[PDB]
Amino acid sequence: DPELRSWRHLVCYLCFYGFMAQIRPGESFITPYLLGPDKNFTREQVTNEITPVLSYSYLAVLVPVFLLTDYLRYTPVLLLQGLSFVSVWLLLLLGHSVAHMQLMELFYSVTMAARIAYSSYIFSLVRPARYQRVAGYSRAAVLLGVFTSSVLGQLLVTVGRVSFSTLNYISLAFLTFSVVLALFLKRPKRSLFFNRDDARMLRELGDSLRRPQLRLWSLWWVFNSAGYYLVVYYVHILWNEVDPTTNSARVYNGAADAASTLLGAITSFAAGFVKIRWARWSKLLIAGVTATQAGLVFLLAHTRHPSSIWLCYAAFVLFRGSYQFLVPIATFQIASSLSKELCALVFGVNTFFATIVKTIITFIVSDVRGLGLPVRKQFQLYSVYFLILSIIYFLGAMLD
Numbered sequence: 138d139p140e141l142r143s144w145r146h147l148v149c150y151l152c153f154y155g156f157m158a159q160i161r162p163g164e165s166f167i168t169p170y171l172l173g174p175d176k177n178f179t180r181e182q183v184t185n186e187i188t189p190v191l192s193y194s195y196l197a198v199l200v201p202v203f204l205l206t207d208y209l210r211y212t213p214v215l216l217l218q219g220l221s222f223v224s225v226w227l228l229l230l231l232g233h234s235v236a237h238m239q240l241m242e243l244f245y246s247v248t249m250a251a252r253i254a255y256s257s258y259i260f261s262l263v264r265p266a267r268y269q270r271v272a273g274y275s276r277a278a279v280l281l282g283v284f285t286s287s288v289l290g291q292l293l294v295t296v297g298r299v300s301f302s303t304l305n306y307i308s309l310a311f312l313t314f315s316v317v318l319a320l321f322l323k324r325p326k327r328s329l330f331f332n333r334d335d336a337r338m339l340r341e342l343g344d345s346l347r348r349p350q351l352r353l354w355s356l357w358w359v360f361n362s363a364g365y366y367l368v369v370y371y372v373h374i375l376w377n378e379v380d381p382t383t384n385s386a387r388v389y390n391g392a393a394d395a396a397s398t399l400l401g402a403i404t405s406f407a408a409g410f411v412k413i414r415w416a417r418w419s420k421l422l423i424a425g426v427t428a429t430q431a432g433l434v435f436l437l438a439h440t441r442h443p444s445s446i447w448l449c450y451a452a453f454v455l456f457r458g459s460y461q462f463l464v465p466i467a468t469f470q471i472a473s474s475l476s477k478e479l480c481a482l483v484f485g486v487n488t489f490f491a492t493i494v495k496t497i498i499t500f501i502v503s504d505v506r507g508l509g510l511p512v513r514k515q516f517q518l519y520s521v522y523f524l525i526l527s528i529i530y531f532l533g534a535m536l537d
């Protein structure tokens with residue numbers, strides 16, 4: 138029986154790999170590990186010299202990985218996604234200079250640019266009749282794997298009282314285990330662009346760019362997702378500015394990346410109801426949430442007292458919880474009439490245009506070759522950037 142051997146030995150393996158590839162307990166505790174006494178980096182060295190290299194290499198490896206993940210049929214990039222993860226946690230545990238953490242953020246941007254490999258792999262592997270049952274079970278393993286990794290990272294730090302250095306050796310036990318799991322993945326018999334079983338993409342783009350909702354939510358995915366990424370990369374440097382007490386027990390970075398995933402699974406679930414119902418007022422639905430993001434970025438830049446670090450965590454859970462609400466709606470309005478050969482090209486070029494904006498703002502605001510702002514004055518620039526973006530869509534919606 139090959140059909141009963143598929144759901145037992147393959148679909149139970151994609152939901153086991155997709156669970157175990159998201160297990161990185163020290164992923165929420167990289168920046169408290171760098172700024173702690175273990176590596177002993179100064180804040181001025183992480184916000185201006187290490188973290189802007191994350192948004193530079195992510196421009197450099199976005200298009201090389203996206204072309205390679207379809208040409209190699211998604212398995213050696215899923216092998217690379219896991220192996221570059223190990224190269225991050227090796228440089229975190231063996232590197233001591235600033236140049237050994239700039240290389241750490243270069244391998245970390247490969248693991249961000251190969252996030253699409255996994256999901257774009259379940260589509261090319263399973264049959265389209267059984268695709269909704271497999272990818273529904275697979276994304277319920279990634280979202281479970283993202284949530285319970287930050288819980289496992291938090292309970293070892295808060296409850297287990299394990300140190301930050303010994304946490305990354307636990308994180309090297311799951312990342313070396315998920316490289317071996319990426320070896321035994323079934324390579325798909327097709328792909329999306331190169332390896333097909335047998336251009337119109339330039340012709341159907343001439344018909345889909347004239348849509349009002351594809352024009353709107355693509356200009357949201359370029360600019361609002363650029364400002365979203367510049368908060369998540371720098372909110373752990375801001376929490377270490379508010380409460381810089383090196384204790385490895387009062388830091389709840391894993392409890393703010395698990396509660397943001399749990400809220401990111403609630404508002405995502407609540408966005409599927411409003412997906413096609415609120416498509417008319419989507420130009421005002423952006424400005425109601427971008428302004429809410431404009432206040433929560435300012436709330437991060439307003440809290441200075443270390444006794445209110447708990448109010449900061451909640452200003453970031455409600456930030457990711459509000460960004461996750463628009464994306465269910467964003468992925469819909471964009472991918473409504475697009476073919477799969479054109480949908481992965483529109484999202485593949487919206488992410489590149491978002492990484493163009495992420496490269497511009499990091500070189501202007503965050504990098505030492507531009508202004509070189511600290512992370513307290515940097516979030517005041519992003520709160521202006523979200524409020525500038527909020528009054529564009531609010532004035533844009535009122536024109537209707």
Ligand SMILES: Nc1ncnc2c1ncn2[C@@H]1O[C@@H]2CO[P@](=O)(S)O[C@@H]3[C@H](O)[C@@H](CO[P@](=O)(S)O[C@H]2[C@H]1O)O[C@H]3n1cnc2c(N)ncnc21
Nearest residue numbers: 252253254256257276279280283401405460461464465468
């Ligand atoms: N269909 C796909 N093709 C190619 N790559 C994909 C992909 N669906 C996911 N991913 C990748 O997995 C990552 C984590 O996904 P999640 O943890 S399973 O959920 C994400 C995350 O919570 C947030 C930031 O997402 P993001 O920065 S783009 O990161 C995603 C993305 O890189 O938005 C959610 N999200 C993204 N897309 C959708 C969607 N279509 N419907 C409902 N929720 C969505």
Ligand SMILES: Nc1ncnc2c1ncn2[C@@H]1O[C@@H]2CO[P@](=O)(S)O[C@@H]3[C@H](O)[C@@H](CO[P@](=O)(S)O[C@H]2[C@H]1O)O[C@H]3n1cnc2c(N)ncnc21
Nearest residue numbers: 253256260272276464465467468469472480481484485488
């Ligand atoms: N974060 C991202 N970066 C780059 N491209 C992205 C992207 N998130 C989405 N897409 C694109 O949007 C297309 C349509 O997505 P949707 O219409 S919004 O929903 C899809 C679709 O119904 C099904 C197969 O379609 P698929 O091959 S994924 O095609 C996706 C994908 O190409 O999987 C659903 N889906 C995708 N991600 C999630 C998720 N995180 N949680 C729940 N459902 C999800």
